[PDB]
From Swiss-Prot:
Segments on the Periplasmic face: 1-310
Family the entry assigns: Belongs to the BamA family.
Knockout consequences: Deletion is lethal. Depletion results in the accumulation of incorrectly assembled outer membrane proteins, including TolC, OmpF, OmpC and OmpA. Decreased expression leads to decreased susceptibility to contact-dependent growth inhibition (CDI), and decreased expression of outer membrane proteins (including in this study LamB) as well as up-regulation of periplasmic protease DegP.
Stretch of the intact protein here: 22 to 351 of 810
Subunit annotation: Part of the Bam complex, which is composed of the outer membrane protein BamA, and four lipoproteins BamB, BamC, BamD and BamE. BamA interacts directly with BamB and the BamCDE subcomplex. The Bam complex has the shape of a hat, with the BamA beta-barrel crown in the outer membrane and the periplasmic brim formed by the BamA POTRA domains and the 4 lipoproteins.
Function: Part of the outer membrane protein assembly complex (Bam), which is involved in assembly and insertion of beta-barrel proteins into the outer membrane. Constitutes, with BamD, the core component of the assembly machinery. Efficient substrate folding and insertion into the outer membrane requires all 5 subunits. A lateral gate may open between the first and last strands of the BamA beta-barrel that allows substrate to insert into the outer membrane; comparison of the structures of complete and nearly complete Bam complexes show there is considerable movement of all 5 proteins.
Domain characteristics, as noted in the entry: Contains 5 N-terminal periplasmic polypeptide transport-associated (POTRA) domains which interact with other subunits of the complex, may recruit substrates from the periplasm into the outer membrane and also act as a chaperone. The C-terminal region forms a discontinuous 16-stranded beta-barrel transmembrane region. The central pore is ellipsoid, and probably closed by extracellular loop 6, perhaps with the aid of other loops.
Places the protein is found: Cell outer membrane
Domain of life of the native organism: Bacteria
Domain POTRA: 3-70, 71-151, 154-225, 228-303
Protein name per UniProt: Outer membrane protein assembly factor BamA
Length: 310
């Protein structure tokens, strides 16, 4: 139908500037608005991740947006993490976007707790319990306290591989010892990726705990792809006038995908840009897989160049 917006009013804005709020909105003063438009605006606003609650409705000729911004995490403190250092935890969280300065989505708390419990698997602790205590502060800030109940550690009692057809479990396993789960998983992955199975993938790993929870039986389910030939390495991006050299590091005829070799390539490039005044060069490679070879697309971005002068 219609309703001509003579103006727009906002309630609840604080950390979010009016101008940006409006930018994310699909309506503006003057546009004619109907229920169809209103849901879209609410959707757009919610889609920003700024608010915990959005309310949009008519009020005369006025379009009224009522918003409840997500609290800002004033601090993040850990309690009970005897085995894992604060930085590692504070980083596992940063990885998940939860961090001081950012906002806290309070409908994701269970994911936060579970994520940390999951991170605890890498340290051999498969029975960690972590509760998050959110404390409201003065403004619309909050403090996030993650209480840890690290469990007892566990050691691999047995390990089985399912999905292998190119190598015997006895063969794959004999390489693990040279030793935690995360470690085995990392060597098994390199193992195949270094041999060309560019599409290799650990689909899932079942972990059966011992009654006293100090032991775990592990069966890891894989999918070996096919062996692939490395058909080339196209380097692109924000270089700093060194294509001639980096390309010398890039390129064989029927050589197969390696992975660590690929990692070696990436590192070679950083170390090259390092000796050139670029200390934070970002190199990321991505595989363009063709079922018939792989073309490595490597994007490089020489950082900023500091010319300090006393």
């Amino acid at each position: 139908e219609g309703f001509v917006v003579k103006d727009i009013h906002f309630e609840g804005l604080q950390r979010v500037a009016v101008g940006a709020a409006l930018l994310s909105m699909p309506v503006r003063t003057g546009d004619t608005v109907n229920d169809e438009d209103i849901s879209n605006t609410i959707r757009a606003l919610f889609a920003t991740g700024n608010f915990e609650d959005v309310r949009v409705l008519r009020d005369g000729d006025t379009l009224l947006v009522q918003v409840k911004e997500r609290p800002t995490i004033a601090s993040i403190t850990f309690s009970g993490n005897k085995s894992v250092k604060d930085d590692m935890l504070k980083q596992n969280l940063e990885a998940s976007g939860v961090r001081v300065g950012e906002s806290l989505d309070r409908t994701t708390i269970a994911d936060i707790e579970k994520g940390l419990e999951d991170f605890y698997y890498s340290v051999g602790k498969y029975s960690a319990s972590v509760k998050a205590v959110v404390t409201p502060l003065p403004r619309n800030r909050v403090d996030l306290k993650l209480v840890f109940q690290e469990g007892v550690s566990a050691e691999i009692q047995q390990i089985n591989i399912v999905g292998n057809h190119a190598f015997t479990t006895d063969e794959l396993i004999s390489h693990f010892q040279l030793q935690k789960l995360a470690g085995d998983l990392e060597t098994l992955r390199s193992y195949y990726l270094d041999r060309g199975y560019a599409r290799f993938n650990i689909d899932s790993t079942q972990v059966s705990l011992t009654p006293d929870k100090k032991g775990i039986y592990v069966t890891v389910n894989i999918t070996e792809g096919d062996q692939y030939k490395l058909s080339g390495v196209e380097v692109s991006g924000n270089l700093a006038g060194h294509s001639a050299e980096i390309e010398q590091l890039t390129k064989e005829p029927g050589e197969l995908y390696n992975g660590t070799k690929v990692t070696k390539m990436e590192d070679d490039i950083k170390k090259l840009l390092g000796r050139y005044g670029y200390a934070y060069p970002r190199v990321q490679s991505m595989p363009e897989i063709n079922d018939a070879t792989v073309k490595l697309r490597v994007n490089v971005d020489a950082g900023n160049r500091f010319y300090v002068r006393k």
